[PDB]
């Protein structure tokens, strides 16, 4: 789906599979968080479903030792003095020792501050222990988490329930047309992007000899030239758009290990899983009731949340008993208006537009020489048109799909292309779509705050600040304190400070709240980028203070207060909202649960070969399942005729569903249902 999606997948740790356990065999002990998991396997990242606890991700700093156990790094303390010497410990080995927490205060030389410090001990027990007994201490505060987990800003402000979903959903993010790096980071966004392999890293140092949209050439120092080819508009495993673009310009000095060209969901070598949106924390005319989301039409007019989705359509020509399937531009009883977008072969032309029902690859097969209908024999004598022995077996566009044909791949047995036994010509047409964001598309933040798009208002309807700028996204207030994930609130505060810029007051000295604040953050530009590492980073006192530091806009006016709130104007009634609303910037990702895929319906269609019931799935154009649970609801209501119809003429009544289709199109009354063919099957299976 995205670069991170792949990266996560390679670091999964399942207990499933041969040699391991089954899903039904696993009790409640296997699944929950064990003490030894610290720094080895994440306690947060795990599926929501029936696989929960049986699947996890490897902690960031961990590694595997030659015996198949999991080791993890710790700093070695000689005698109250931290040493840069690091040794990897296994699970049971650590239990024999005693480990201090990472954030414990350390002297500039290496010594501890207090005699008694926080201490980790065997069996998950913790106590205060004198500094003389300290063996090791953690490498990092963020040592226990996984890769996707450490990418959640203010993690320690969100409950494990939503923070879990916050990690799982990132993996579901969709690559947009172009991607922006988050205003609020955690620092992990860089190393994740590089180690993904879906960016282009320079092997050896040198200078960009030539750059094009096609490839980048690098002139090394010894003289040799390596050329890096750009993946352009390729279809991923999940129909997303892997598209790479050159970062460097021609003539730039580039060193080894530097990102010279990034891919989808990447901005300057950083994981760009979403966009920075101007949020507003408030109910608004109910359109965001129960976790729904309201969007500015600006995100539709500026493609801010627009994505490209590529599909691979396939069809082949085989050797049959009545001859052989041939791919031709001549299809029985079709006008030249339908064939208009094909070439001479029968293939669609690259760049052509395709809607559902249209033809991609014209194929016809010799139909069996069975006696044609005496009523169709008569119909062929009047108009004197002799019947062809070739039936239409063309590759048409599936319901819902549409877009521009962006390439053809043809494999012919004729052109020595090696095919499976029986196949002559195989055609692959690739169609991409430029899906703008719409109603029902699932959006989310990094804090387990999900939901679908309820409504996208015109840009003017949007609640706007004093200077006229309309907000992008309107989240509902109700669904915040319940989820305990108020890290989305802190992200909004720091997110605003990062957009406006700030400057701590240095007159009369450096203030007491911004005393722990490193020098480099005492002055910030508009649209600045910052890091809030998990279990480190910003604290509530500095955030509050920074809200006072907010630099005024172009008109010389500050827009938000020290509370973080601001005054909005209702774009509909014009009047100002009575109370200050919390405004700022938030990072919102486009998840891969789009209505354009999710929507589906069916009148009649294909049917089961045995039970004679409808088929199942959107891929087979099947109808919904009216299960045992749903038949109780009907029964409870006392809607016998509705229930009967659903299981008879709507289902597997061979003669009924046909005579229902006829009764409808003729405008008569629905006939009386017969016997469910499935019941006939049962009485034969019993026999």
């Amino acid at each position: 789906n995205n670069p991170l999606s792949g990266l996560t997948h390679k670091r999964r740790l399942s207990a499933l599979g041969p040699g391991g356990l089954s899903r039904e065999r696993a009790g409640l002990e296997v699944r929950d968080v064990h003490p030894s998991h610290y720094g080895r396997m994440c306690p947060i990242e795990t599926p929501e479903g029936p696989n929960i606890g049986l699947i996890g991700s490897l902690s960031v700093y961990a590694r595997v030792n030659p015996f198949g156990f999991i080791e993890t790094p710790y700093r070695k303390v000689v005698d109250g003095v931290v040493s840069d010497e690091i040794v990897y410990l296994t699970a049971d080995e650590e239990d024999r020792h005693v480990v201090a927490q990472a954030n414990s205060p350390i002297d500039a030389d290496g010594r501890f501050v207090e005699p008694r410090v926080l201490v980790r001990r065997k069996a998950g027990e913790v106590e205060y222990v004198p500094s003389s007994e300290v063996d090791y201490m953690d490498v990092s505060p963020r040592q226990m988490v996984s890769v996707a987990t450490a990418m959640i800003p203010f993690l320690e402000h969100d409950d494990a329930n939503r923070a879990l979903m916050g990690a799982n959903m990132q993996r579901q993010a969709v690559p947009l047309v172009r991607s922006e790096a988050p205003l609020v980071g955690t620092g992990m966004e860089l190393r994740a992007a590089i180690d993904a392999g879906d960016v282009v890293v320079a092997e050896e140092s040198g200078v960009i000899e030539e750059v094009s949209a096609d490839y980048i050439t690098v002139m090394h120092d010894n003289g040799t030239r390596r050329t890096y080819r750009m993946r352009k508009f390729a279809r991923s495993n999940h129909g997303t758009c892997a598209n790479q673009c050159p970062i460097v310009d021609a003539g730039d000095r580039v060193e080894a290990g530097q990102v010279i060209a990034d891919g989808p969901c990447t901005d300057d070598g950083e994981m760009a899983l979403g966009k920075n949106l101007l949020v507003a924390i408030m109910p608004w005319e109910g359109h965001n009731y129960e976790d729904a989301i309201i969007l500015s039409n600006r995100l539709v007019e500026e493609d801010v949340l627009t994505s490209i989705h590529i599909e691979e359509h396939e069809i082949d020509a085989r050797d049959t008993k009545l001859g052989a399937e041939e791919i031709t531009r001549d299809i029985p009883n079709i006008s030249d208006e339908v064939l208009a977008d094909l070439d001479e072969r029968g293939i669609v032309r690259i760049g052509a537009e395709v809607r559902d029902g249209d033809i991609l690859v014209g194929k016809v097969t010799p139909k069996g020489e069975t006696e044609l209908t005496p009523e169709e024999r008569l119909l062929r004598a009047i108009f004197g048109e002799k019947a062809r022995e070739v039936r239409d077996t063309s590759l048409k566009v599936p319901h819902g799909e549409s877009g521009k044909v962006i390439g053809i791949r043809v494999f012919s047995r004729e052109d020595e292309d090696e095919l499976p036994a029986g196949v002559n010509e195989l055609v692959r047409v690739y169609v991409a779509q430029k899906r703008k964001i719409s109603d029902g598309d699932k959006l989310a933040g990094r804090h387990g705050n999900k939901g679908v798009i309820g409504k996208i208002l015109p840009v003017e309807d949007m609640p706007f600040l004093a200077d006229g700028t309309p907000v992008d996204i309107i989240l509902n207030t109700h669904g915040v304190p319940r989820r305990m994930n108020i890290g989305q609130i802190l992200e909004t505060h720091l997110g605003w400070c990062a957009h406006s810029g700030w400057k701590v007051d240095a007159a009369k000295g450096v203030p007491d709240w911004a005393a722990r604040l490193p020098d480099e953050l005492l002055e910030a530009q508009p649209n600045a980028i910052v890091s809030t590492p998990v279990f480190d980073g910003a604290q509530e006192a500095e955030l509050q203070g920074l809200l006072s530091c907010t630099l005024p806009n172009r008109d010389g006016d500050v827009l938000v207060d020290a509370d973080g709130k601001a005054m909005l104007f209702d774009g509909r009634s014009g009047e100002p909202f009575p109370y200050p609303v919390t405004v700022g910037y938030m990072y919102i990702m486009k998840l891969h649960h789009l209505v354009d895929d999710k929507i589906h319906a069916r009148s009649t269609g294909p049917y089961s070969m045995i039970t004679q019931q409808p088929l199942g799935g959107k891929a087979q154009f099947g109808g919904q399942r009216f299960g045992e649970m749903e038949c109780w609801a009907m029964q409870a209501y006392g809607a016998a005729y509705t229930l009967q119809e659903l299981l008879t003429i709507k289902s597997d009544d061979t003669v009924g569903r046909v005579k229902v289709y006829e009764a409808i199109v003729k405008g008569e009354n629905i006939p009386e249902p017969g016997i469910p063919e499935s019941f006939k099957v049962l009485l034969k299976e019993l026999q």
């Binding site: 980071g185 620092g187 290990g257 604040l517 953050l521 980028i529 590492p533």
Partner: peptide, 23 residues
Amino acid sequence: SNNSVPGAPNRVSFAKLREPLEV
């Protein structure tokens, strides 16, 4: 800065100085 190793954009960090080891 946070990761001053590859040649990356400068992302300033609220932090206690982390020099044990790179990821």
